[PDB]
Design a protein around this ligand. Structure first.
Ligand SMILES: *[C@H]1O[C@H](CO)[C@@H](O)[C@H](O)[C@H]1NC(C)=O
Length: 497
């Protein structure tokens, strides 16, 4: 194990420096006997996922807040955690020396890292690319004979994905999402701007688009990479806003409904990739529960939809109860998955804030809220960016857990990285969220889950400045006496047998 090498850039906290020959890492996991718990702590004051151990006694010496585990109250099962392998992220990673590259990849997917098991893959270009393009830019090739993968996939994205799964501690699932389709298939013949597919669901246009997903999946299959799921379109509501800058393809909720039912679903279901999951929406949760009602209430469409994917930033504000909550109630069997979660856009804030503890807290808090509202998985945006928040052919407006400084063969791990880690590293796929009852009103954000092996995992986030005394109870083991320091994030682990 190697500790974090702190560096400050004038913000609330520090970043962990990593170069070609050094990067903070964890030792293989070793779970303690019954009556003992493990604590991983990170604090704005510097500490980064530091490990410590303590006892779980049958005696309760705490007189403050009490969180009781209710393993019997069971909810959703976790799919996993990850990030997007965009053109930008791959260019930044591939800009470091090979040795540095592996330390970065291990940071994310290795047991020595935080164990990512999900990777979102853009289908062709998006705003985080250094050039506009699709897999079939040659006009009027409805049978997609010239469909092919550019250097971005074959030289950048794909090789990095392979290297990721190799280092991968756990099985990694791949999620694919399109931004725009060839311009000749669109009403406005542009990669961006207000424009949807031409004609209506069912014609040669929509059929050509549907085929495109299959062509993508084949091309990747040819490269020994199979996907777990695909989104019907990235942020489809954006393609309805006149003059949208990023590559898009607008779909009204009705249009997505007819498209899934008429073209995408049938075409996918009739291909050798029929086992690939189809996720709808993949947009801001403010569009729920409406978008859900329009699509899922149509059997011809619903039968093809495995789950609803949501985005929603952090700098802004949204009500989870009215959005994720209501949607689960109306459709309890359609999983909710977070396909994109970024932050750092406030018009007054710098795009990339090296060491910002606030942005980290926004991730852990947002992940906790999602978990409390049935979400089964999390997919961060760009896996890595430069200090300017790029490259982005349109404009930099978001941060990233890892920032690469190309000119010094070094990369920085932001508070964001560890906050994500507090979850992704200790919540393997298959884990199931369970009850965690607070004895009284408090200022902490907590969530409990049960590993597939039965052990317990509890994350406690303290966004306040004051230290909060806390007692955690597992009816089967006893009481865990601890303290949640102001501006900290904890993750407890313990055997229940
Ligand atoms: C960065 O890695 C360690 C950590 O600070 C440092 O000692 C080393 O000199 C740096 N790498 C190089 C070769 O500059």
């Amino acid at each position: 194990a190697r500790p974090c090498i702190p560096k400050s850039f004038g913000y609330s906290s520090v970043v962990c420096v990593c170069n070609a020959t050094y990067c903070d890492s964890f030792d293989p996991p070793t779970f303690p006997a019954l009556g003992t718990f493990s604590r991983y702590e990170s604090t704005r004051s510097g500490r980064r996922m530091e490990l410590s151990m303590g006892p779980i006694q049958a005696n309760h010496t705490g007189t403050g807040l009490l969180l009781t585990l209710q393993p019997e109250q069971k909810f959703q099962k976790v799919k996993g955690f990850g990030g997007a392998m965009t053109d930008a992220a791959a260019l930044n990673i591939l800009a470091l020396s090979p040795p540095a590259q592996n330390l970065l990849l291990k940071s994310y997917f290795s047991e020595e890292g935080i164990g990512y098991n999900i990777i979102r893959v853009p289908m062709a270009s998006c705003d985080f690319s250094i050039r506009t393009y699709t897999y079939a830019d040659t006009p009027d090739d409805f049978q997609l004979h010239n469909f092919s993968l550019p250097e971005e996939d074959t030289k950048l994205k794909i090789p990095l994905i392979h290297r990721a799964l190799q280092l991968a501690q756990r099985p990694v699932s791949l999620l694919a999402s399109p931004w725009t389709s060839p311009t000749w298939l669109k009403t406005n013949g542009a990669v961006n701007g207000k424009g949807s597919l031409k004609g209506q669901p069912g014609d040669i246009y929509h059929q050509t688009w549907a085929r495109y997903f299959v062509k993508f999946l084949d091309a990747y299959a040819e490269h020994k990479l199979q996907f777990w799921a695909v989104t019907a379109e990235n942020e489809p509501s954006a393609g309805l806003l006149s003059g949208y800058p990023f590559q898009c393809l607008g779909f009204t909720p009705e249009h997505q409904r007819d498209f899934i039912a008429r073209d995408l679903g049938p075409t996918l279901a009739n291909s050798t990739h029929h086992n690939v999951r189809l996720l709808m929406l993949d947009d801001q949760r403010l569009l729920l529960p409406h978008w859900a009602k329009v699509v899922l209430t149509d059997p011809e469409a619903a039968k093809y939809v495995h789950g609803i994917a949501v985005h929603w930033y952090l700098d802004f504000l949204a009500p989870a109860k009215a959005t994720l909550g209501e949607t689960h109630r109306l459709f309890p069997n359609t999983m909710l998955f977070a396909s994109e979660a970024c932050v750092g856009s406030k018009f007054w804030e710098q795009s990339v804030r090296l060491g910002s503890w606030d942005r980290g807290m926004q991730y852990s808090h947002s992940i906790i809220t999602n978990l409390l509202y049935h979400v089964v998985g999390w997919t961060d945006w760009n896996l890595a960016l430069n200090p300017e928040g790029g490259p982005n052919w349109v404009r930099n407006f978001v941060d990233s857990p890892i920032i690469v400084d190309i000119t010094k063969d070094t990369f920085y791990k932001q508070p964001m990285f560890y906050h994500l880690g507090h979850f992704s590293k200790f919540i393997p796929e298959g884990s199931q969220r369970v009850g965690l009852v607070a004895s009284q009103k408090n200022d902490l954000d907590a969530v409990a889950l049960m590993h597939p092996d039965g052990s317990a995992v509890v994350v406690v986030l303290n966004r306040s400045s004051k230290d909060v005394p806390l007692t955690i109870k597992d009816p089967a083991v006893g009481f865990l006496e601890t303290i949640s320091p102001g501006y900290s994030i904890h993750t407890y682990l313990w055997h229940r047998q």
